[PDB]
Design a protein around this ligand. Sequence first.
Ligand code: HEM
Ligand SMILES: *[C@@H]1O[C@H](CO)[C@@H](O)[C@H](O)[C@H]1NC(C)=O
Ligand SMILES: *[C@@H]1O[C@H](CO)[C@@H](O)[C@H](O)[C@H]1NC(C)=O
Ligand SMILES: [Mg+2]
Length: 227
Amino acid sequence: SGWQAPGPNDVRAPCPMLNTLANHGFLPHDGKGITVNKTIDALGSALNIDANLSTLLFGFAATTNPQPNATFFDLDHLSRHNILEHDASLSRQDSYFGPADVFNEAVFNQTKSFWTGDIIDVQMAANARIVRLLTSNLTNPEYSLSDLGSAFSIGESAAYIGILGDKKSATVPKSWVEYLFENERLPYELGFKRPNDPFTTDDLGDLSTQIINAQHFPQSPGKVEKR
Ligand code: HEM
Ligand SMILES: *[C@@H]1O[C@H](CO)[C@@H](O)[C@H](O)[C@H]1NC(C)=O
Ligand SMILES: *[C@@H]1O[C@H](CO)[C@@H](O)[C@H](O)[C@H]1NC(C)=O
Ligand SMILES: [Mg+2]
């Protein structure tokens, strides 16, 4: 009860959380036909994301629909390279090597190695993201990161801390984040509980600023801080 894997006619995204929400049925389980009201209600119901943040993210998602000025998207629209989907993902390979939508064990093993305690803090999250950016630049001859992609990358690391964990301490249990990525299921049994306070655009911006502030390069090696 409450969760079912995708089947052969269902579509999924490069987003661990939207995939999780579709697997649970907060979003349509086939991944298709997601509108702004469905996004607001699903992310509100599951996670207590604010309507305004849900609407902002919906607006970006709709730009990935190949139909112009669309009022919906399908989860696989989000996989289109270099719209929202970007290189140096934490758990997906770069498009150049292989499909950038599905979980990739080799890539996630790299990320996990920078989560060095039982509790992930901002420093660990920033560290992991950094190593992915530099690794992709040095191994992918087609590596790119647009301004929007950089903003998305920073906000994805802010999101797993603040939405799955405690936005005020800016920490999250490592096991919870691992579980989300590796199962695309919410880690209720490990202790996750939907927060009582809504998660807002300003919350995401505050954690994104914290991520950037935890980066200590002597000199920035490419696009590491663009919002
Ligand atoms: C309508 C809402 C959302 C949209 C449109 C969206 C879109 C995306 C997209 C396109 C990616 C792939 C970027 C890439 O790594 O190449 C992504 C990754 C991600 N999203 Fe979402 N997302 C949404 C909501 C959420 C929420 C609520 C969370 C909360 C935990 C979340 C957490 C993440 C994380 C952690 C990644 C990085 C995955 C990896 O780097 O391997 N997203 N999202
Ligand atoms: C990821 O790490 C696991 C856990 O040690 C290991 O069994 C697996 O072979 C690794 N995968 C890659 C592709 O390195
Ligand atoms: C990749 O690294 C080079 C330094 O070799 C830098 O000039 C470039 O901006 C980096 N690319 C991105 C997209 O960050
Ligand atoms: Mg990617």
